[PDB]
């Protein structure tokens, strides 16, 4: 999903 991959911990 590159930029839309989960950005949280």
């Amino acid at each position: 999903a590159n930029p839309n991959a989960n950005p949280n911990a």
């Epitope: 999903a1 590159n2 930029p3 839309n4 991959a5 989960n6 950005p7 949280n8 911990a9």
Partner: antibody, heavy 123, light 108 residues
């Protein structure tokens, strides 16, 4: 008090730079990806930048690439937007925005928004 | 991905059932959020993942749709529901784009 508070807005002359701050409180800031989203007067919302919870990945809209830098200080719970080469079409309210917590491979919607700080690019 | 909302404006009365439409230019599966915004304030998240109701949001709001066509329904319009409504995609590899918004105003 789960909130985001932006500061650092004001009048800036075209070509000059500006740093926006966003103070987060009431939640575990350093576990959240964060965004900036802007809204020009009379128009809709435009995504600007994303930063991973740890600062390890950053992405920007084409309209601001190479001019805007997003960063964060996780020990002080602040998000930053460094804007250089500001132009007239950057004139907008700037919101710092938290992504809704999700487990899994995918990021989520925008669940927490600051009050917004106005940036006006005028000579 | 470009998002388009219709109508740009619409006039409704308290107690009306109102449906706002949002269309993606290509499939976004169900990675779609709806927001409410009133003048001078920040947007408020209503619906995420095209149909899931955000925690504080009253049950008269709902959403449905997948792929390229999505709708936000207010089952019974109430006085504080007059506002601008935005849809927004967060599909994989698609970054984040918003519709131009649908303003709901008071019919008289």
């Amino acid at each position: 008090q789960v909130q985001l508070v932006e500061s650092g807005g004001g009048v800036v002359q075209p070509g000059r730079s500006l740093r926006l701050s966003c103070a987060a409180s009431g939640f575990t800031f350093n576990t959240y990806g964060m965004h900036w989203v802007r809204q020009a007067p009379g128009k809709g919302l435009e995504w600007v930048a994303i930063i991973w919870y740890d600062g390890s990945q950053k992405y920007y809209a084409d309209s601001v690439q190479g001019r805007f830098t997003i960063s964060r200080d996780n020990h002080k719970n602040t998000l930053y937007l460094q804007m250089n080469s500001l132009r007239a079409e950057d004139t907008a309210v700037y919101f710092c925005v938290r992504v809704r917590f999700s487990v899994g491979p995918h990021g989520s919607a925008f669940d927490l928004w600051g009050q917004g700080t106005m940036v006006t690019v005028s000579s | 991905v470009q998002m388009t909302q219709s109508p740009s404006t619409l006039s409704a009365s308290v107690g009306d059932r109102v449906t706002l439409t949002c269309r993606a230019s290509q499939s976004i599966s169900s990675w779609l959020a709806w927001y409410q915004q009133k003048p001078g304030k920040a947007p408020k998240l209503l619906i995420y993942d095209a149909s899931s109701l955000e925690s504080g949001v009253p049950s008269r709001f709902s959403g449905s749709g997948s792929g390229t066509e999505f709708t936000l329904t207010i089952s019974s319009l109430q006085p504080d529901d007059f506002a601008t409504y935005y849809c927004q995609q967060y599909n994989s590899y698609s970054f984040w784009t918003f519709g131009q918004g649908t303003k709901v105003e008071i019919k008289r």
